[PDB]
Design a protein around this ligand. Sequence first.
Ligand SMILES: OC[C@H]1O[C@@H](O[C@H]2[C@H](O)[C@@H](O)[C@H](O)O[C@@H]2CO)[C@H](O)[C@@H](O)[C@@H]1O
Ligand SMILES: OC[C@H]1O[C@@H](O[C@H]2[C@H](O)[C@@H](O)[C@H](O)O[C@@H]2CO)[C@H](O)[C@@H](O)[C@@H]1O
Ligand SMILES: [Br-]
Ligand SMILES: [Br-]
Ligand SMILES: [Br-]
Ligand SMILES: [Br-]
Ligand SMILES: [Br-]
Ligand SMILES: [Br-]
Ligand SMILES: [Ca+2]
Ligand SMILES: [Ca+2]
Ligand SMILES: [Ca+2]
Ligand SMILES: [Ca+2]
Ligand SMILES: [Cl-]
Ligand SMILES: [Cl-]
Ligand SMILES: [Cl-]
Ligand SMILES: [Cl-]
Ligand SMILES: [Cl-]
Ligand SMILES: [Cl-]
Ligand SMILES: [Cl-]
Ligand SMILES: [Cl-]
Ligand SMILES: [Cl-]
Lengths: 599, 599
Amino acid sequence: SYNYAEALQKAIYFYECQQAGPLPEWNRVEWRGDATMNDEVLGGWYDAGDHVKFNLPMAYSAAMLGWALYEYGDDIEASGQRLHLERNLAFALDYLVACDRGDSVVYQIGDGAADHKWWGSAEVIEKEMTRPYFVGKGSAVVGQMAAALAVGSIVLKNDTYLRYAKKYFELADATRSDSTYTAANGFYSSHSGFWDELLWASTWLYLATGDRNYLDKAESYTPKLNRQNQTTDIEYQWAHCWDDCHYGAMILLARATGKEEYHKFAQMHLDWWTPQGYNGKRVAYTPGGLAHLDTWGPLRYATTEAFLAFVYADSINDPALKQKYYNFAKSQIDYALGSNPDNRSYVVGFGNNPPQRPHHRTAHGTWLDKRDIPEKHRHVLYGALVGGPGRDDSYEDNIEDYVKNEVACDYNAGFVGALCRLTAEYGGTPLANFPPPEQRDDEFFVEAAINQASDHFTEIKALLNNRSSWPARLIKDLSYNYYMDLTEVFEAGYSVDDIKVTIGYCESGMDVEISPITHLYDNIYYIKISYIDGTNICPIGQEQYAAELQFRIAAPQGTKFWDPTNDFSYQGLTRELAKTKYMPVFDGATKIFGEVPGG
Amino acid sequence: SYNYAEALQKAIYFYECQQAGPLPEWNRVEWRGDATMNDEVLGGWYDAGDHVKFNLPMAYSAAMLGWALYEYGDDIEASGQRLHLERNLAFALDYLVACDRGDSVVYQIGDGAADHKWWGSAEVIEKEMTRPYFVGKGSAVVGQMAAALAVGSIVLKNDTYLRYAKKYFELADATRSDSTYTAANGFYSSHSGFWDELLWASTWLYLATGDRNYLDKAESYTPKLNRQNQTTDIEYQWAHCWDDCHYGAMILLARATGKEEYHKFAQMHLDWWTPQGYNGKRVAYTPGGLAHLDTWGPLRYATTEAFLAFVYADSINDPALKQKYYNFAKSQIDYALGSNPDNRSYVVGFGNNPPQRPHHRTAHGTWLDKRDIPEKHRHVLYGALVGGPGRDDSYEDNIEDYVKNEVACDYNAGFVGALCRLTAEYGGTPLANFPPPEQRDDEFFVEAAINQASDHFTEIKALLNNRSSWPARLIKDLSYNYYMDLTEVFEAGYSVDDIKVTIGYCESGMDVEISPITHLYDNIYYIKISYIDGTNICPIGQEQYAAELQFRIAAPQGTKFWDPTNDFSYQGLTRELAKTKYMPVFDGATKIFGEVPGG
Ligand SMILES: OC[C@H]1O[C@@H](O[C@H]2[C@H](O)[C@@H](O)[C@H](O)O[C@@H]2CO)[C@H](O)[C@@H](O)[C@@H]1O
Ligand SMILES: OC[C@H]1O[C@@H](O[C@H]2[C@H](O)[C@@H](O)[C@H](O)O[C@@H]2CO)[C@H](O)[C@@H](O)[C@@H]1O
Ligand SMILES: [Br-]
Ligand SMILES: [Br-]
Ligand SMILES: [Br-]
Ligand SMILES: [Br-]
Ligand SMILES: [Br-]
Ligand SMILES: [Br-]
Ligand SMILES: [Ca+2]
Ligand SMILES: [Ca+2]
Ligand SMILES: [Ca+2]
Ligand SMILES: [Ca+2]
Ligand SMILES: [Cl-]
Ligand SMILES: [Cl-]
Ligand SMILES: [Cl-]
Ligand SMILES: [Cl-]
Ligand SMILES: [Cl-]
Ligand SMILES: [Cl-]
Ligand SMILES: [Cl-]
Ligand SMILES: [Cl-]
Ligand SMILES: [Cl-]
């Protein structure tokens, strides 16, 4: 119905957009550079359109990418995406290993409230704030980390991942408490508790090792799972998700053990998701056919359930059940890709009329801590599955809609597995030239205005701008030149010593020097304005993105010869601030913007 | 009793405090300089503790000082004050003549609202605002100008004053309207109308010329005077004052004509002011014995009536009446000098416990456009009679009490006449060394702090202050030096050209240059910070009284030899702003504050 291979290609590339520093050599995202290099644990993924590393959803996302490979890795080699998926997974798993602290782990980098208060690109956040880390031994977060590493060890044939999966599982299982998991409260609180994580982790360890001790542990956790309302059934009326993976664990155990209790659960749970429901109970559905679990990330939940349904349907033989679950799964993926009342993709950069304003700071590329400027995103967040429509299929592509236009690691994770299943079956050709280069705008440049003109002087207001975005970046050795023609000075009988440079305003905190008037060639002279620590010009807010200087170049009071109309840098200037190419900008000795006289 | 000669001496000196620029050579006030030199008409007096020239009360005050000389000039020669009173009067009269515009006069300089909104010294007000002038021919203001010049012509034997007195009287008499008197509205509105001024001016012209035509004009105006309530009697229940001089005119006409109608009026009016009253009717009296006409300027009204009562008493023969009026008069003057429930003088700089916080901008001497700082007045407004107490004798000396601590030309004017009469009777020795010099503060100086420090640089925050007050003044060619010892630079094998001067903050609007590092002697070098228009550093407000610059002097990054502790200008600096004598200030090439290495 769609080119699922292209969808898969893009959905994987999304994770490269999320990578924290240092970026791997193979990162394909021209607008991403090393970021948050002062973090206590390097690498891994930023969670959403923010810059926090939240280990619970991060590890969940990795576990799901691992599961995608575990089921379908061989079957996707034709799409050309297997190597891409594998190394993207390994990047996250390396971070999980790097979190080890022995009897505890680093479980978060960044403070949610502080991070979310600021809107700007990953590469410049250390200029705005200093990022904390958090250490603990929460059974849910540590258990999820163990599960991700366990499946990772299988699909990446990696003994180190298995060693760490065991370490973390032993810690989570010994601790049996979420009390030291607090830094993510209100963002990724542990809602369901930790027994589902221990189940999920022990299940994957059994699949990794064949050690029955893990299967005994797994089966021991099932009576501890939450019940459905006040009944005796295990809870089934929700989705497999970052908080609760018992759903997927029960499916894996149905297949691994063949035991009827797991099959009964899988069928009850999946039936509740399908249009026919489970004995009169059913997830809410939009009229447009999307199973709609909650206001937040409905596409995330539906596409994750599609992956579970595909895996379960593939694992059973009953034709009616297989067709029912397969049709459900495909219907949810197809909705996300464009089979909906608006006929539009909900995957950024894919398909017909995709979202163009995802709630994502670094893809947006602002310079002034605002969402509304720039009015269009500077970058394409290819592959990102957005939150999606409301319960009535309604949606508007709006950066301010932090629900419907949310994007996140966990939104993409199950989605990737489902796309693997569909590419396996239908094939499709990935895009050969992907990703294509972006149109860039000017990043470092001066805006200038004539602040005052007189018959004996020129006074310039000049703002040296850093609106970098490909990638956002800091340049220390910034300078710009203002060129003049002093022919009229010499003709009137005066010299360079008779021309005085003064300053009328220099912005606080911007260490600056102005050169003496310097000969270029002939009667062409210039001053250089140098910012000694240009990294303080940075796209982090209204005050920081440009440094303002007002400078005056003056012949003696009373003289009548001063003529700025032949001065190179005066060309086109008005009384209103405007970008000018005639006051070129330099990084050290290298010109990075503008033009020079002759030259 | 009191030393009335000293009180008179100081009461006259008050007028020198009020002189607008250009000051006469004989001005005795060390904290007054030429002020408001751009005014449309130069000289004259500021009205109160403000800087408006309001001609109606200015001319009334001049007329009253003239009247004091007319009655008592011979009788005060012993007090030594006659020549002081004469030249003080001539300064105001010269202004009145300079107001002539042919068919109209300048009757105001300054916009009352804008003037009063700002709190600062006369000499700097043109940095804060532009002062408009107003032209018209209102009969009250022009008539009072005429009267002032008519008595002035007599007592100063001056034909030019008589010529303008006639011309102004004719203009007032032709116009018979206050319609063109607009700019003083709500400050010195014409409340009584203009017939009383025509009466007062024509009476003085008769006394100056002996031309009975002026006497006939004077008598023609008396039926046009306002009535007392709804009766046929001329209004008598108020005081001779800036708005209405018919009271004094009637007294002068009683003496000049001997006619019963004027004596009947004089006695009705004066009896109403005495404790014995007129037919059971009387001005309010405080329990402490002050005749209290109104909330505003009660001492002004009572001391003016004291002068009228003295003049009328001296003009009649009835010992009972003479005693009644003399006792009234002396009681009111004595109350003002200290015969009151608090035993305290209401004349600044005189007697026991005088007011120290008069509502007077220039005597206060702020630099910040605030009344509360400085908390003590920097100057002594000797001789100013304040507004005075409430009807219950209540009073607190508070700069914020713009009623009780108001001071003005018209408050002092009648008061001077009354003091003339009392020193005529009782003698007294004026103060020999008056005025004594004031304690002065530093006026131009740098406040500096170490803003940032490291092993390769010093960064200074420097505020160049103008808190001048002796007198407040402007200096254009202001600079200050920062002296260093570069011994350690040379000791490291580096040169002067390896040291970098940069700026970290330059206050907006303060055109500034920093010299290259300049040799002084030995290994001592300096930078000069020069303000191109130092007059923008001025004591007119919170942002203007000091120019802020943050400058950094830096050795190359990575070097560790930099040594600020042998730098002359670094001595005593902390991280908090403080005045320093080691960053000396210059006016052109002349040092005006601080110290230099060596000397
Ligand atoms: O209580 C229903 C359901 O909650 C799941 O946690 C949710 C939480 O309710 C929601 O506010 C947050 O945004 O998402 C989490 C994860 O989906 C919980 O995992 C389930 O066990 C529970 O049945
Ligand atoms: O009506 C009383 C009295 O007013 C005199 O004008 C006052 C004015 O009322 C007051 O507001 C202002 O502060 O001072 C003026 C002058 O004292 C007016 O001169 C009288 O004729 C009249 O009797
Ligand atoms: Br492409
Ligand atoms: Br010239
Ligand atoms: Br060029
Ligand atoms: Br006019
Ligand atoms: Br003295
Ligand atoms: Br000295
Ligand atoms: Ca859980
Ligand atoms: Ca030129
Ligand atoms: Ca009047
Ligand atoms: Ca030194
Ligand atoms: Cl802990
Ligand atoms: Cl169905
Ligand atoms: Cl199937
Ligand atoms: Cl886009
Ligand atoms: Cl824009
Ligand atoms: Cl009496
Ligand atoms: Cl007498
Ligand atoms: Cl005082
Ligand atoms: Cl103070």
